[PDB]
Design a protein around this nucleic acid. Structure first.
Ligand SMILES: [K+]
Ligand SMILES: [Mg+2]
Ligand SMILES: [Mg+2]
Ligand SMILES: [Mg+2]
Ligand SMILES: [Mg+2]
Ligand SMILES: [Mg+2]
Ligand SMILES: [Mg+2]
Ligand SMILES: [Mg+2]
Ligand SMILES: [Mg+2]
Ligand SMILES: [Mg+2]
Ligand SMILES: [Mg+2]
Ligand SMILES: [Mg+2]
Ligand SMILES: [Mg+2]
Ligand SMILES: [Mg+2]
Ligand SMILES: [Mg+2]
Ligand SMILES: [Mg+2]
Ligand SMILES: [Mg+2]
Ligand SMILES: [Mg+2]
Ligand SMILES: [Mg+2]
Ligand SMILES: [Mg+2]
Ligand SMILES: [Mg+2]
Ligand SMILES: [Mg+2]
Ligand SMILES: [Mg+2]
Ligand SMILES: [Mg+2]
Ligand SMILES: [Mg+2]
Lengths: 143, 141, 64, 101, 66, 84, 148, 57, 67, 189
RNA sequence: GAUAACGAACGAGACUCUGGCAUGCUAACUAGUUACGCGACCCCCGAGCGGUCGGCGUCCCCCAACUUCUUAGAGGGACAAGUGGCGUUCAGCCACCCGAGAUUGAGCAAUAACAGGUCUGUGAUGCCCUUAGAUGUCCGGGGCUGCACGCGCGCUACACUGACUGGCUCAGCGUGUGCCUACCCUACGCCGGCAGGCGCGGGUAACCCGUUGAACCCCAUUCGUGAUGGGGAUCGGGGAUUGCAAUUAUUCCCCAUGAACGAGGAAUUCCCAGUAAGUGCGGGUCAUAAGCUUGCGUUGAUUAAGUCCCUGCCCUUUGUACAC
């Protein structure tokens, strides 16, 4: 009856969107998906084989709510608490390559286009399927 | 040309402004349904005004909230204070004062903070101590 | 059985007592039998109308 | 007819407001359209210093602070008219910065 | 030389260099193994410490007694 | 260095990573009956590791032998099947 | 599935190092001196075996594969920045030191420093900190002396 | 556009200027009845005003 | 800690002697009176003086006092 | 109508101790959906007597620094503990919590009066407010110690601590401490 | 109030700053809302004046109003004023109503002193010493950090009320390109796994960084009572950045190594409400640069409304062989 992204649980929504990106096997996952650490503040690599789709799903969801975000804004969004061991913790940003490639991969799907000032924003095609996936996320809930 | 009241609820530095306009029972916070505002652990807090007054009093009005500043818990309290103050102000300006009284006293007799703001703020830090009152450890020998 | 527990309502707060002021002499009236009041030392915050559970209910407080 | 914004800035509230009131009036009585003085957020230049000159004693601190209050006056007038309205509003503590277009 | 920050190059292997430690020019042969290190890293600037008997004040029992 | 304390050592827990013929059946019969069913109570009741206790419970839920009460990242509670 | 396999290896003998078979394979191979959590995980992903299984459930064929990847990381597209022995001071070989081999490399590196009389070597010869730390108040392992 | 400083610095820079100017005059007109100094900036020029008794000196 | 200092009391007793007729039992009217018949440099001081004046007026109207 | 967490009713809870009837808030005008009120009960003396007893339990589970200022986690912990209690006992978890409070708070204590050191304690009575306050403290610290370095989660540790206290068994940490306090007071009587 | 005192003066209070209130007032394209138009997308028509939009415009300039939210400025507001009780009427105290608030937190701060600290802040300074093989000054190197040890402020821990993996989502204070003076905050795009590099812009700032996507927390995951997936000390290898110079390892990142520590003896510190504690974030220092400090928000209690017992303080009487 009319469902957009901001009407459904975002935890479920990212899971569903990641599966859709996985099922439509066009996203360009890089070769270094399984050997890198997502951020210098992390100790271990992700406990998930196809985490790239989940990160890509999260980014597209994020670009829907705040358009114009570039790589640095992605690192800020995915930044976290670096436990420096015996010294006190601080805030550490995410990986720039990981963010840049997630952005670059979404352009191949024609879901994300570079913004005029800078950063990237969602194509109407990229906005249509997110609202569509939100529809089935809502559809599962009421069922 | 429409029945509309903008009323603001507050908690610490979290400001939540509720646009209460003549509608059909649509309540949304920052463009999200009221049941989708985290953390759901304090969700009954957001649902307090609706639960105590019922759906029928919210039926003929649509509320949209813009929330800024503060933290997750303060944002929830301010949001619930705005929805309470709005259904009171809306019933005050357009509906009669008689009915506006019962929606007010019922809210107050349950929780005073639904209508009346909490004046508490962070006390300033004073030198010679980590915080407002605590002082650094004193060593004598 | 012997020395059954007794309940008495604080009717008056005489004042504080004890070395650091931790206790409070209060006059308590037995609820089962009115007109019978005794003084008792109470630790913790107490006020008028409180009900106290006296495990042993035959000792007058003196000064403590 | 040019848009002119005069930037007002001082450390004295009373002295600045007497200028913001005086300029707004002077324009109104000459039939000039005025944008109400825009009160920009106050800047609080704070300095905290150890107080003692040598490091002996209880750790006491001096909380120095400078407050700077900024005002914008935007209106349409020829450059000729705005010259004299600025000249009349003299003040030691208030600094004026006229801009055009 | 005073240049404690010079790094040993392969060209300078087989040279007898007196590296100033602050007081004396310590004589050091540039063995080929020294490639990649600093010239002053083989001229220590301090005598290693051999502890003596702790003095009065080194402990409470000693410091406060009059 | 001088120790101003004492350690209350306890006989250590040797917990089974995987189930043997003694326990797999012990889980299939006694665990569903319990009024309260959690990975903690199962681990202590029949001496297995928590991850095995967490794992073993979820098939019992899929098999329908136990009923889930609540699920949380730090607490999962199951109960025995109800009748009416 | 959850019942103990009939060939469960309760302990493993890899590179003359016991590997506990009750731990997850990701954290079991951590016991090998030279393999940490990061290195253990990257080699198992190259071995294409599910990490959600214990080390004792691991068949003999894959166990042999896992060792070969650990001995030969550069052959299985593991980048040089994972290697704990990058650009050796003797032959620029890039490799990961393992088992008593790490011990030999560390011993050779310390003796190298001690044989050239370098400051970090001398500081290693003595029981002193070599990374510039202040030793006046910390790293106290000795006994109280006192004033007589 | 040629050269400009922040307002926060601006107020510190001229406040420092007055502090040195007052200090210099205090050292200079010590034998005179120097009471203070006031700076009067205007569009053509500034008017360093010296409040002092015995102005003839 | 609501004891009024001599400055509050000296002003208030004097105002009732000097302008008793224009005063009354209402703090809000008395507050306004003090604004014109006296020069009170701060608002808080004015409300304290008017507070004591209101208190005095009741007493000065039920019996004689120092004023 | 109002139920704690939306499922636990309050109108069925009965207080079987007139001494603590005025210091346990489990009834009309005190029934709340969540033990998170952000009220100013610490502004005035005795104002915490009107604080909901479930909130008071929630407040007292934030202990030992690492858990300070984490009331959400504690609301979850109390939420799961009530679910666990209902499974074991079968009746209202609030009723179990009330019965735990009644049986855990000591009825006689022993204050210390020593003229010059060598303090010799003297037996005294306990005010109803302190009976409630310490009963919550004992039950919370009983759960805290049971869950430390143990696989069983704090939620279950809190549940059987309340369940044992409600039945009065010596297995409860709170009942052990209460009996010791009464026994010492009996000796110092 | 009493009164051999009377009339005063400082301090206290008043005062200044700050916080809480104002749908009253004054204005705002360097603040925003609401309405409208345009556009993007969603579902069924259950089309609808529907739902989302930090997409765009309605500035000036032809194309909207307003000022709730925001800024900051003039006023207002709280005074023990109202009611009840107590107090010798009195000064006042307690409780309650109304109310945003019925004690917000700081700044300033008397007399007389201390052989308290500072001559290593000064072109503040007496005296004294030195002055060309200098205690002046400069340049090179080293030291301040040297480690059987004793102590002080701390940081991080001892884990499951946790760690880790991912996902989701909220701050406030505040700084930012330079007399000398080299030295700024950084968006975006590309390269690199990271630290970083390169290019291209904005901002002397309510204008750009920045809607400051902070952290704990929240939700899911793995773990499983094992010095362990707790802890992260020590140490090997390698890469980059700042600098004229990085060794005694500046700092940073990677792989590996994986110490004590299982809640701490006698003792002892700080603290009562948005406080303690957790948690992160600005400023200062800064070519490089926080385990410190100084400030800020964020989550947020237990206990107490007492006392003089301990450590001290103030007033009166009292004793004194004390007056450094
Ligand atoms: K001198
Ligand atoms: Mg983050
Ligand atoms: Mg704090
Ligand atoms: Mg001794
Ligand atoms: Mg546990
Ligand atoms: Mg306003
Ligand atoms: Mg009377
Ligand atoms: Mg003084
Ligand atoms: Mg001296
Ligand atoms: Mg000096
Ligand atoms: Mg010095
Ligand atoms: Mg030198
Ligand atoms: Mg030093
Ligand atoms: Mg010392
Ligand atoms: Mg100190
Ligand atoms: Mg760790
Ligand atoms: Mg520069
Ligand atoms: Mg902007
Ligand atoms: Mg370990
Ligand atoms: Mg503990
Ligand atoms: Mg810094
Ligand atoms: Mg320092
Ligand atoms: Mg005393
Ligand atoms: Mg002390
Ligand atoms: Mg005598």
């Amino acid at each position: 009856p009319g469902v957009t992204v901001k009407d459904v649980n975002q935890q479920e929504f990212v899971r569903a969107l990641a599966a859709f990106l996985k099922k439509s096997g066009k996203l360009k996952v890089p070769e270094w998906v399984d050997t890198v650490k997502l951020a210098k503040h992390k100790e271990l690599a992700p406990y998930d084989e196809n985490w790239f789709y989940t990160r890509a799903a999260s980014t597209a969801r994020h670009l829907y709510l705040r358009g114009g975000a570039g790589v640095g804004s992605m690192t800020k969004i995915y930044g976290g608490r670096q436990r420096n061991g015996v010294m006190p913790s601080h805030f550490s940003r995410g990986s720039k390559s990981v963010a840049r490639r997630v952005l670059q991969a979404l352009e191949g799907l024609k879901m994300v286009e570079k913004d005029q000032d800078g950063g990237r924003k969602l194509t109407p095609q990229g906005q249509r399927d997110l609202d569509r996936i939100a529809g089935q996320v809502a559809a599962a809930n009421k069922k | 040309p429409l029945q509309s009241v903008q009323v603001f609820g507050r908690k610490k530095t979290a400001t939540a402004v509720a646009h209460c306009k003549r509608g059909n029972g649509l309540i949304k916070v920052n463009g999200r349904p009221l049941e989708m505002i985290e953390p759901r652990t304090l969700q009954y807090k957001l649902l307090e005004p609706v639960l105590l007054l019922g759906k029928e009093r919210f039926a003929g009005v649509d509320i949209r909230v813009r929330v800024k500043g503060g933290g997750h818990v303060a944002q929830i309290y301010a949001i619930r204070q705005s929805i309470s103050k709005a259904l009171v102000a809306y019933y005050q300006k357009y509906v009669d004062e008689a009915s506006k009284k019962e929606i007010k006293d019922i809210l107050i007799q349950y929780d005073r903070t639904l209508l009346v703001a909490d004046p508490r703020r962070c006390e300033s830090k004073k030198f010679g101590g980590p915080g407002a009152r605590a002082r650094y450890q004193k060593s004598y020998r | 059985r012997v020395q059954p527990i007794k309940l008495a309502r604080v009717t008056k707060v005489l004042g504080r007592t004890g070395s650091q002021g931790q206790c409070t002499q209060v006059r308590v009236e037995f609820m089962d039998d009115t007109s019978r009041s005794i003084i008792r030392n109470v630790k913790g915050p107490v006020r008028e109308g409180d009900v106290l559970t006296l495990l042993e209910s035959e000792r007058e407080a003196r000064r403590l | 007819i040019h848009r002119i914004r005069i930037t007002l800035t001082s450390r004295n509230v009373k002295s600045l407001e007497k200028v913001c009131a005086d300029l707004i009036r002077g324009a109104k009585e000459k039939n000039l359209k005025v944008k109400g003085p825009v009160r920009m957020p106050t800047k609080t230049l704070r300095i905290t210093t150890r107080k003692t000159p040598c490091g002996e004693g209880s750790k006491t601190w001096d909380r120095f602070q400078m407050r700077i209050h900024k005002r914008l006056i935007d209106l349409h007038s020829p450059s000729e008219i705005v010259k004299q309205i600025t000249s009349i509003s003299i003040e030691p503590g208030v600094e004026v910065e006229v801009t055009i277009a | 030389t005073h240049l404690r920050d010079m790094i040993i190059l392969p060209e300078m292997v087989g040279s007898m260099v007196g590296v100033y430690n602050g007081k004396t020019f310590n004589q050091v042969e540039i063995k080929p193994e020294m490639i990649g290190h600093y010239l002053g890293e083989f001229s220590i600037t301090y005598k290693p410490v051999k502890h003596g008997r702790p003095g009065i004040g080194a402990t409470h029992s000693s410091r406060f007694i009059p | 260095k001088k120790k101003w304390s004492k350690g209350k050592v306890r006989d250590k827990l040797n917990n089974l990573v995987l189930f043997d013929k003694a326990t797999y059946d012990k889980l299939c019969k006694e665990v569903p009956n319990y009024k309260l069913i959690t990975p903690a109570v199962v681990s202590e009741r029949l001496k297995i590791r928590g991850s095995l206790a967490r794992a073993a419970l979820q098939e019992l839920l899929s098999k329908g032998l136990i009923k889930l009460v609540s699920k949380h990242r730090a607490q999962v509670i199951y109960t025995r099947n109800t009748k009416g | 599935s959850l019942v103990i396999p009939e060939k469960f290896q309760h302990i493993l003998r890899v590179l003359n190092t016991n590997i506990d078979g009750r731990r997850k394979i990701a954290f079991a191979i951590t016991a090998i001196k030279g393999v940490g959590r990061r290195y253990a995980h990257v080699v198992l992903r190259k071995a294409d075996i599910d990490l959600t299984k214990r080390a004792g459930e691991l068949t003999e064929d894959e166990v042999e594969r896992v060792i070969t990847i650990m001995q030969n990381p550069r052959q299985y597209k593991i980048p040089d920045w994972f290697l704990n022995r990058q650009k050796d001071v003797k032959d620029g070989k890039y490799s990961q030191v393992l088992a008593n081999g790490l011990d030999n490399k560390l011993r050779e590196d310390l003796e190298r420093l001690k044989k050239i009389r370098a400051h970090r070597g001398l500081r290693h010869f003595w029981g002193l900190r070599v990374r510039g730390q202040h030793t006046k108040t910390t790293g106290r392992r000795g006994r109280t002396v006192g004033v007589s | 556009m040629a050269v400009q400083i922040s307002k926060k610095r601006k107020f510190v820079a001229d406040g420092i200027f007055k502090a040195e100017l007052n200090e210099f005059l205090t050292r200079e007109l010590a034998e005179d009845g120097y009471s203070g100094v006031e700076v009067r900036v205007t569009p053509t020029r500034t008017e360093i005003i010296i409040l002092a008794t015995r102005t003839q000196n | 800690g609501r004891v009024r200092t001599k400055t509050v009391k000296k002003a208030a007793r004097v105002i009732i002697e000097k302008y008793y007729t224009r005063l009354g039992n209402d703090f809000h009217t008395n507050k306004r009176v003090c604004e014109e018949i006296a020069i009170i440099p701060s608002k808080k001081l004015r409300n304290k003086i008017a507070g004591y004046v209101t208190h005095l007026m009741k007493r000065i109207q039920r019996g004689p006092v120092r004023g | 109508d109002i139920k704690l967490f939306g499922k636990w009713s309050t109108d069925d809870v009965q207080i079987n101790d007139i001494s603590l009837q005025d210091y346990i808030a489990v009834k009309e005008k005190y029934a709340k959906y969540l033990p998170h009120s952000a009220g100013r009960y610490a502004a005035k003396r005795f104002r915490k007597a009107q604080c909901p007893i479930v909130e008071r339990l929630t407040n007292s589970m934030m202990m030992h620094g690492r858990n300070n200022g984490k009331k959400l986690m504690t609301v979850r912990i109390v939420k799961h503990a009530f679910e666990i209690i209902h499974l074991l006992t079968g009746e209202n978890p609030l009723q179990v919590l009330v019965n735990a409070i009644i049986n855990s708070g000591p009825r006689e204590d022993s204050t210390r009066i020593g003229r010059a050191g060598t303090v010799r304690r003297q037996a005294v009575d306990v005010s109803p407010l302190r009976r409630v306050n310490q009963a919550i403290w004992l039950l919370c610290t009983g759960a805290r110690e049971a869950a430390f370095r143990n696989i069983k989660t704090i939620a279950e540790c809190l549940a059987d601590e309340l369940i044992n206290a409600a039945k009065g068994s010596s297995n409860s940490y709170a009942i052990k401490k209460k009996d010791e306090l009464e026994r010492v007071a009996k000796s110092n009587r």
